[PDB]
Amino acid sequence: MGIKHLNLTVADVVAAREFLEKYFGLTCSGTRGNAFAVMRDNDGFILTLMKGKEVQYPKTFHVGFPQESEEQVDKINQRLKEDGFLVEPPKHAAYTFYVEAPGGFTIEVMC
Amino acid sequence: AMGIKHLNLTVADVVAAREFLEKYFGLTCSGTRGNAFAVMRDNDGFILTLMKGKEVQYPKTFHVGFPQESEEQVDKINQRLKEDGFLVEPPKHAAYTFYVEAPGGFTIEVMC
Ligand SMILES: [Mg+2]
Ligand SMILES: [Mg+2]
């Protein structure tokens, strides 16, 4: 089954969880207080969030959330910008942009 | 008296109601029992539990209201619901209000 789990250490589990729910439609299947949250997508990928920052992720590190259309990429970009997150217009290579998620890791959004 | 702090809202589909409330209204799920039950919380500690039921119907004028800090915020939720395929009309000055038929089979009011 290849790669199906990522344990992402973050600065703030609650903030990272709510961001992923709002913008990326992940679902939470469990928590241990504010220390731990288990997030799932539709395909059974498990992305656990774990408190305890000592260090920043390498700057090129990112997690990618593909979208069904360029319109959907634009929509997420727009709403992030409106909601106070620091984003720039997506670029055509895939049609792609990046955002820093609360918690302290970069997300790639693309079609 | 400490007032009103819980609603048990019977729904047709807990999963669908939960995800809608998370996406559009920022509620947080604090627990589930399978697909039958979910405990949702708002920022002020109100507890909204969603409970699967059969043949769920509410009186026509029943609704749950989510007040907003500004009329611009009302517009934003309206616009996003519309773009995302929910049937909403523009908000009206009656409070500045609109309604939406929510997943799970109940009406939500959004106002300032
Ligand atoms: Mg990449
Ligand atoms: Mg009302």
Side-chain angles (χ1 to χ4, degrees):
Chain A
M1 49 261 295
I3 303 175
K4 287 297 187 288
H5 174 52
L6 187 76
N7 187 244
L8 280 177
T9 322
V10 292
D12 185 337
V13 169
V14 173
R17 173 185 170 183
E18 63 182 45
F19 186 79
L20 291 163
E21 291 172 348
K22 178 168 176 171
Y23 299 98
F24 299 100
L26 296 189
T27 306
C28 185
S29 57
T31 64
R32 320 278 190 191
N34 70 6
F36 192 68
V38 181
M39 317 299 303
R40 294 180 187 249
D41 70 13
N42 275 340
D43 288 320
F45 194 93
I46 309 305
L47 190 185
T48 56
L49 300 165
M50 184 174 280
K51 192 179 46 175
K53 199 43 64 90
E54 187 94 8
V55 308
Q56 293 294 106
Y57 285 93
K59 72 203 160 72
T60 59
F61 173 82
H62 57 260
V63 183
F65 285 78
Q67 300 304 313
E68 278 161 43
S69 61
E70 298 194 359
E71 180 174 12
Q72 280 299 293
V73 175
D74 280 338
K75 182 183 286 190
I76 298 164
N77 188 268
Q78 182 202 342
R79 291 172 186 193
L80 287 168
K81 186 158 269 180
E82 289 175 354
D83 297 352
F85 295 91
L86 265 52
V87 298
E88 75 178 10
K91 291 178 198 179
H92 290 280
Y95 190 51
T96 305
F97 72 96
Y98 302 91
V99 59
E100 318 213 80
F105 65 102
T106 304
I107 289 174
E108 176 197 19
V109 185
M110 75 294 199
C111 174
Chain B
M2 304 161 82
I4 298 144
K5 292 293 189 301
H6 175 48
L7 182 72
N8 188 244
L9 192 64
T10 315
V11 298
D13 181 341
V14 167
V15 176
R18 174 181 168 185
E19 91 190 338
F20 184 78
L21 290 163
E22 290 167 348
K23 188 172 179 169
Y24 297 100
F25 298 97
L27 299 194
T28 303
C29 183
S30 57
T32 60
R33 194 183 103 272
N35 71 118
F37 185 76
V39 183
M40 317 296 304
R41 299 184 59 90
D42 73 2
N43 205 239
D44 260 320
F46 192 93
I47 308 293
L48 172 69
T49 50
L50 304 166
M51 179 170 304
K52 201 194 190 192
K54 283 313 147 226
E55 220 183 290
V56 170
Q57 205 33 262
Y58 286 92
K60 19 273 99 64
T61 56
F62 171 81
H63 52 266
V64 184
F66 290 79
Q68 302 300 312
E69 207 59 39
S70 70
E71 296 195 357
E72 174 156 340
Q73 291 307 121
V74 178
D75 282 345
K76 207 153 96 176
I77 299 170
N78 190 263
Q79 173 203 359
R80 292 176 183 189
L81 285 169
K82 188 176 182 201
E83 294 174 350
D84 292 354
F86 298 89
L87 313 182
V88 289
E89 64 174 73
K92 306 274 134 76
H93 289 94
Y96 184 66
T97 316
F98 72 92
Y99 303 85
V100 60
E101 313 265 62
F106 64 100
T107 299
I108 284 172
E109 174 198 23
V110 181
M111 73 291 200
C112 179

